[PDB]
Each structure stands twice: as structure tokens, then as C-alpha cells.
Amino acid sequence: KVFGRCELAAAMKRHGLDNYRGYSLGNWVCAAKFESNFNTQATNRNTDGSTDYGILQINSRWWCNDGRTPGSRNLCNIPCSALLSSDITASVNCAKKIVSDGNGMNAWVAWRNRCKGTDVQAWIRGCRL
């Protein structure tokens, strides 16, 4: 499933990401854009044996278990497969855990390089209206 910008914005808002841990909604939209291009099925293999899953590219080394990543911690307590659903709930719930547990949104590389430092509110511009 490929979401639309405002479509994702609304869904994320419903799930309580707006200003969660201090990060306004635009942050999350921008992250999804650059991490997955709004695609719920995206996956990416890493040199360390881990894989990044779904719309928010959640990593299998720390966060979810994919049954094939060495040194798996499963801090979200979910199978990575659940993160490939067209429904974003699992991804959002795990994302909150990630951000609450440390480095904030720095866990997302695309966020840090391509979102942070720009006017992220522009990402939710024109969505309600």
C-alpha cells in the first residue's frame, strides 16, 4: 500500500504521533517519505544481517524479530512481518517505543539527513484544509 501524503498525515495523527515526545507530525511524514516513499511493503537489507521493514523502515536487529537476524533484541515485541501490513498501527506503536527509548528520531537515518533542519511543518500543509 502506498499512502498519499495527507492520507498518511491523518492516519498518523489518529494514532497519536503529533508531538509525541516533542516531535510535531511533519517530522513523521517527512521520515516516511524519505525512508519508504510512503510504501507499506518496502524492505531493505543491511550488511549486518538485519533488514528494515515497512513504512517506517523499522530495523530487525533491535526492534522486531524476523527470525533471521543475528543478535535480535525484539524491543517492540513483535514479528517484523506485522510491520508489513497495510494498516500502520503496529509500525506506529513500535515507532513510539523507538523514540521513547533514546536518541529520539535519530533512529531514522533519512530523518536525520533529509528532514531535520528543514521546515517539517510543510509536510502537513494543506491537509486539513
Curated annotation (Swiss-Prot):
Q: Which residues bind substrate?
A: D101
Which terms are listed as keywords in the entry?
A: Allergen, Antimicrobial, Bacteriolytic enzyme, Disulfide bond, Glycosidase, Hydrolase, Secreted, Signal
Ranges in coiled-coil conformation: none
Tissue specificity as recorded in UniProt = In the egg white and polymorphonuclear leukocytes.
Catalyses: Hydrolysis of (1->4)-beta-linkages between N-acetylmuramic acid and N-acetyl-D-glucosamine residues in a peptidoglycan and between N-acetyl-D-glucosamine residues in chitodextrins
Q: List the disulfide bonds.
A: C6-C127, C30-C115, C64-C80, C76-C94
* Protein purpose: Lysozymes have primarily a bacteriolytic function; those in tissues and body fluids are associated with the monocyte-macrophage system and enhance the activity of immunoagents. Has bacteriolytic activity against M.luteus.
Q: Which family does it belong to?
A: Belongs to the glycosyl hydrolase 22 family.
Official protein name in the record: Lysozyme C
Q: Which organism is it from?
A: Gallus gallus (Chicken)
